[PDB]
Design a protein around this ligand. Structure first.
Ligand SMILES: CC(=O)N[C@@H]1[C@@H](O)[C@@H](F)[C@@](OP(=O)(O)OC[C@H]2O[C@@H](n3ccc(N)nc3=O)[C@H](O)[C@@H]2O)(C(=O)O)O[C@H]1[C@H](O)[C@H](O)CO
Ligand SMILES: CC(=O)N[C@@H]1[C@@H](O)[C@@H](F)[C@@](OP(=O)(O)OC[C@H]2O[C@@H](n3ccc(N)nc3=O)[C@H](O)[C@@H]2O)(C(=O)O)O[C@H]1[C@H](O)[C@H](O)CO
Ligand SMILES: CC(=O)N[C@@H]1[C@@H](O)[C@@H](F)[C@@](OP(=O)(O)OC[C@H]2O[C@@H](n3ccc(N)nc3=O)[C@H](O)[C@@H]2O)(C(=O)O)O[C@H]1[C@H](O)[C@H](O)CO
Ligand SMILES: CC(=O)N[C@@H]1[C@@H](O)[C@@H](F)[C@@](OP(=O)(O)OC[C@H]2O[C@@H](n3ccc(N)nc3=O)[C@H](O)[C@@H]2O)(C(=O)O)O[C@H]1[C@H](O)[C@H](O)CO
Lengths: 233, 233, 233, 233
């Protein structure tokens, strides 16, 4: 099938929906549930979370799912099997703590050339990709052929999130490598994004999509009990 | 086949045997051999022991077997692959210390949805299931379709046991999840149990069963030599 | 095929060779090369060494092989996968230090019932079997059906050996368990041994065997250089 | 196919190219890119690097590849799975740091007899082989039948290299073992080498080969940033 992969850059709001493929799977990441409307609908094929907040994102997702704000078929931890990037003890026992989730690296490492590319530039040059690229890589490994990009921009101030994380060339070069090496097609869904300097626009299909508005929704990350943190540590 | 799973609640004594399936396998747990009579016969399909007393239960079982008080085809350690719940070094080398036994988690983890369910509520909410649920989960993973419950109540003071261990909604919710998710049937064999507020009675078959009385039997856990403990540590 | 398994008890010298099967494989152990004559010939199917002297026995064997005193097809380390019995780091990397050798436990653990039997009595009762039983167990796992025993007695004072190691019911019970459980046949080749109180004599076949005498032979264990010991530590 | 394996001894310059097989794969090692001319062409089937400089050779190779000085299909780390010879933590996570490279030991250990041979003499006698032998062993494991040797001599002073590494019978005996045991053929391409006392000359085929000269080339090992070293440590 087709996949729309979203970062959560301002252009997430600036999709041209006449270009929306209309049968598609959706990939979301990180604080996607901060969106003020369902810019891509409620149903995700995969959501992707950074290893350093995976424990709190998983807890929050289960609340979104049960509160019926979103559904997802897959839950990914966006890992790389590198000690300087993530806690290895957590990776080793992951499937036992989170039996319905997946380490993204099980799919990422299937792209041997891109994994080699990524590693070489990160270890030796400190060049890092964003979730939106990691997601294209996992999407390619999953067998997707047409990938439609949105919310990727170059380049939220919620209380809980601020308390846990008090915090382009690389991306475009990576995305080009992927496209060139694996022979899939990349499209750009956001004409007013800088991504559109670099990526061929999704074609107009005069498609429609209803953007449902969100009211009384979850717009910050949840924080587990101390006793939960004690178990996980 | 059919399985009767027993906890050792007071209702173990209060089975309505007219409802007993009459070809069945039996699952027992923990201090089941404290029973003052053979309420389910001598022959077990599986006995299940908590990891923290597994070393002393295994020793005791071998004595029951050789003293011909009980037989069992399988011996399970009821583990979960969680550091805060059990000693991981012991899990890793288990099959070498106990080559005729099984880690229950090899079967429990086959129920991906229930394992996810269990983990999420235990890690984040401190909700724990009892052996009787763990046993239904292992029974489902083993391919059983009709499961008859007894000795589960909501919710023994022997010397050796006291020296080693100086010591419902969750259960009913778990059992419902299992039944709903795996499409097996749960029956209740003890009409006078609270379990019967929640679980459909096993149907009357006017079956008979002989309850053999126990005399001069093993009714406390055995304690290994110090030298045995030294090896195991 | 048939196997003769030898301990190195006095009865090794007291074989009745009229009873020798005449097509057979030979299992030897430990300081077998101390024999003053080739009581079973030069050609071994397997030699078995205790883990605690495996490094010095392997070194010595390679010298026997190259000095053409003995040949062997297999080299076994007689291990059990138990921390209190052997060094586990050495077991883990064994095949990399000794790529032409085998951990005996890879075959021993194939006899699930005997492994369970062994473990239970050793861990809990401190009952240990001798190499001659370990060898029957490995021989059974290897597919042998007729096993002829010698040099097992119930129940050498060389310089190097003394410097490295300054040092029955269980056996007979184990051997009986093996015979009963795996349905192989045990024979006794040494009529004047106590083993013959317990084991059915190999039948007379009026077979002949030449006992070659040994002259100028290796009759103590060799000791590796310090630098070798430094690597191995 | 045929393989030319090169060490980088003086005889690398002294190939008799009339004897060059003319369809062949090339194996290079270590500081091969110091060559002042393309004595074997630019295209390598495999390059092999010692584990202790693998991090800096890999970085340097990627620069050679991108600077179009050389191409290679395979990148090998010449390891042995021995703690005293290499860092084991690095071996364990190798494929994640270097996803397009290979541990040479995955192929070397396929030659069970040679691996046994190597280990026995190194651990116990401190006899070590050179890269050129390690390379023949990997070449045999890879399915090569005819192996043409060069740059092996019995038995560079660049700044970066000097800063990282401030630094025959065994070889000939090993090469003979390989030839004898695996039934491949060894040839010698350098008539004026001592190797030719021991190895049958590649036959004259009056073949031609163009030796391209090298100008403005990479002739020392590159040194990664500190921050790269920090990640890798
Ligand atoms: C603090 C920190 O370092 N934050 C990083 C950020 O540099 C980047 F690594 C990324 O960005 P993330 O927030 O998930 O948002 C996902 C995508 O949304 C787009 N976007 C978002 C906001 C904005 N103002 N301009 C944009 O363009 C980006 O193009 C990106 O690819 C990522 O993983 O790619 O993740 C965050 C956090 O580590 C993460 O949110 C923790 O849950
Ligand atoms: C001290 C402590 O925490 N004990 C726990 C208890 O909270 C519970 F985890 C359980 O209960 P366990 O004793 O095996 O008994 C098995 C079953 O028998 C029923 N029953 C028993 C006695 C009673 N008076 N009312 C009852 O209802 C329960 O419904 C339960 O499912 C269990 O694993 O499910 O195990 C025991 C011990 O850890 C175990 O005995 C050590 O060998
Ligand atoms: C010091 C110490 O504890 N020694 C043990 C011993 O208790 C026993 F574990 C055994 O005996 P081992 O010497 O190999 O000899 C092998 C067989 O030869 C027989 N025999 C030998 C001499 C004798 N005088 N009477 C006999 O009966 C035994 O019946 C035994 O099965 C064994 O592994 O079975 O191994 C030795 C050493 O650990 C080993 O030699 C180190 O290389
Ligand atoms: C300092 C130190 O110990 N150096 C060793 C050396 O003893 C030997 F282990 C070897 O030799 P290496 O340099 O790669 O060169 C590869 C081959 O080139 C030949 N040759 C080279 C120069 C010369 N003057 N006479 C020669 O004969 C040898 O026959 C050898 O097989 C090896 O791995 O076989 O590797 C080097 C370094 O560890 C390596 O360069 C680090 O990258």
């Amino acid at each position: 099938k087709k996949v729309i992969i979203a970062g959560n850059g301002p252009s997430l709001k600036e999709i041209d929906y006449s270009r929306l493929p209309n049968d598609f799977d959706v990939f979301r990441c990180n604080q996607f549930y901060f969106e003020d409307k369902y810019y891509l609908g409620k149903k995700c094929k995969a959501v992707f979370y950074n290893p350093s907040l995976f424990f709190e994102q998983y807890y929050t997702l289960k609340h979104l799912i049960q509160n019926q704000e979103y559904e997802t078929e897959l839950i990914m931890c966006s890992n790389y099997n590198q000690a300087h990037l993530e806690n290895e003890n957590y990776v080793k026992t992951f499937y036992d703590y989170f039996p319905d989730a997946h380490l993204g690296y099980d799919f990422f490492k299937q792209l041997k050339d891109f994994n080699a590319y990524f590693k070489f530039h990160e270890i030796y040059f400190n060049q890092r990709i964003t979730s939106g690229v990691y997601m294209c890589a996992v999407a390619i490994a999953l067998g997707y052929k047409e990938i439609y990009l949105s919310g990727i921009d170059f380049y939220t101030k919620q209380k809980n999130l601020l308390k846990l994380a008090p915090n382009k060339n690389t991306d475009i070069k990576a995305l080009e490598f992927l496209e060139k090496t694996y022979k899939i097609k990349l499209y750009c869904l956001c004409p007013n994004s800088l991504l559109a300097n670099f990526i061929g626009l999704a074609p107009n299909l005069n498609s429609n999509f209803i953007i449902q508005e969100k009211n009384n929704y979850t717009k910050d990350i949840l924080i587990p009990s101390s006793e939960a943190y004690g178990k996980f540590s």
